[PDB]
Amino acid sequence: LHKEPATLIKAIDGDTCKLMYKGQPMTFRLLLVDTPETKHPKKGVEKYGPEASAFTKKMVENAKKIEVEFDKGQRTDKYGRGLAYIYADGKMVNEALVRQGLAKVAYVYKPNNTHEQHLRKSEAQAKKEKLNIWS
Numbered sequence: 413l414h415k416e417p418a419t420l421i422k423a424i425d426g427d428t429c430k431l432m433y434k435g436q437p438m439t440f441r442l443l444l445v446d447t448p449e450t451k452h453p454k455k456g457v458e459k460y461g462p463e464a465s466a467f468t469k470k471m472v473e474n475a476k477k478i479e480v481e482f483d484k485g486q487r488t489d490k491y492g493r494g495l496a497y498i499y500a501d502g503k504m505v506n507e508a509l510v511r512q513g514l515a516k517v518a519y520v521y522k523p524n525n526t527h528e529q530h531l532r533k534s535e536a537q538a539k540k541e542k543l544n545i546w547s
């Protein structure tokens with residue numbers, strides 16, 4: 413996998429944001445995780461949703477460098493959102509949320525699963541430490 417620079421346009425919620433990639437604005441959705449809903453009426457404002465959103469926002473807003481890393485399978489989902497592992501100053505946002513108990517490992521679609529085990533070990537840690545979602 414190769415990391416590529418991007419520029420933050422707007423953080424939307426815990427796992428979706430708009431970035432300027434390859435000269436064009438695109439909304440991105442973090443690979444392999446799921447932060448709680450704060451938008452969709454069918455799900456309503458789920459618990460920790462606002463929190464996951466605050467965590468992500470702070471993280472990407474205060475970063476000097478943002479990089480996107482596509483996996484080896486498809487690069488966009490059915491809604492046209494880019495699918496990637498996002499890094500804020502070298503720290504993977506996907507992992508950070510999981511480790512904090514603000515996201516669950518989900519939507520594991522082969523072959524876009526290169527970092528699955530890494531994210532799972534962090535989630536098991538958040539779980540045993542009964543953090544947020546796991547409390």
Ligand SMILES: Cc1cn([C@H]2C[C@H](OP(=O)(O)O)[C@@H](COP(=O)(O)O)O2)c(=O)[nH]c1=O
Nearest residue numbers: 428441442443444445446489490495519521
């Ligand atoms: C992370 C991810 C999301 N999705 C889809 C599944 C879900 O679609 P449905 O709308 O059909 O449930 C939705 C989950 O993202 P959200 O958490 O943003 O809803 O996006 C994929 O298609 N593949 C992925 O790798």
Ligand SMILES: [Ca+2]
Nearest residue numbers: 427446447448
């Ligand atoms: Ca979500």
